[PDB]
Amino acid sequence: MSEDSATVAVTDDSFSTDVLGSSKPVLVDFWATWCGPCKMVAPVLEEIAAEKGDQLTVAKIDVDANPATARDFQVVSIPTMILFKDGAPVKRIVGAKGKAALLRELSDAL
């Protein structure tokens, strides 16, 4: 038994430099450290991260660093997922739902 290791979180300041800097396809998911529905989408991100983890790298952001986003509309949980290909936007989904939803990301992106 063993799991994958193609998941690494990036920094807000060193986000573009990494994503845009990496010609390869990179996926990022926005969420709040104090997010409510953590379990509902707990395993999802896991299976989804390993699903297309080999094809591309999956990472997550920390609302704590960028509160201006959530604070904008007084949001406590921002369960969103955005895909980045060639240092540019390719996909963008919002809504902490079943893995079936996020899965579409790989279906459309790949």
List the helices and strands and how they pair.
Layout: H1 16-19, E1 26-30, H2 42-51, E2 57-60, H3 67-72, E3 80-85, E4 88-94, H4 99-109
Parallel strand pairs: 1-2
Antiparallel strand pairs: 1-3, 3-4
Q: Which sheet architecture does the biggest sheet show?
A: 4 strands, mixed
Shape: globular
Backbone structural class: alpha+beta
CA radius of gyration is 13 Å
> What is the fold-level CATH name, i.e. the topology?
Glutaredoxin
Helix and strand string, N-terminal first?
HEHEHEEH
Count of individual beta strands: 4
At the first level of CATH, the class is Alpha Beta
CATH superfamily: Glutaredoxin
Widest beta sheet: strand line-up: 2-1-3-4
How many angstroms does the end-to-end distance come to?
27 Å
Total number of helices? 4
Number of domains: 1
Protein described:
By secondary structure, the chain is α+β, with helices and mostly antiparallel strands. It has one domain: Glutaredoxin (3-Layer(aba) Sandwich). The chain has four helices and four strands. It has a four-stranded mixed sheet, covered by helices on one side. Strand 3 (80-85) and strand 4 (88-94) form a beta hairpin. The radius of gyration is 13 Å and the shape is globular. The PDB classes it as electron transport. Keywords: PROTEIN NMR Thioredoxin Mycobacterium smegmatis, Structural Genomics, Seattle Structural Genomics Center for Infectious Disease, ssgcid, protein, electron transport. It forms a monomeric assembly.
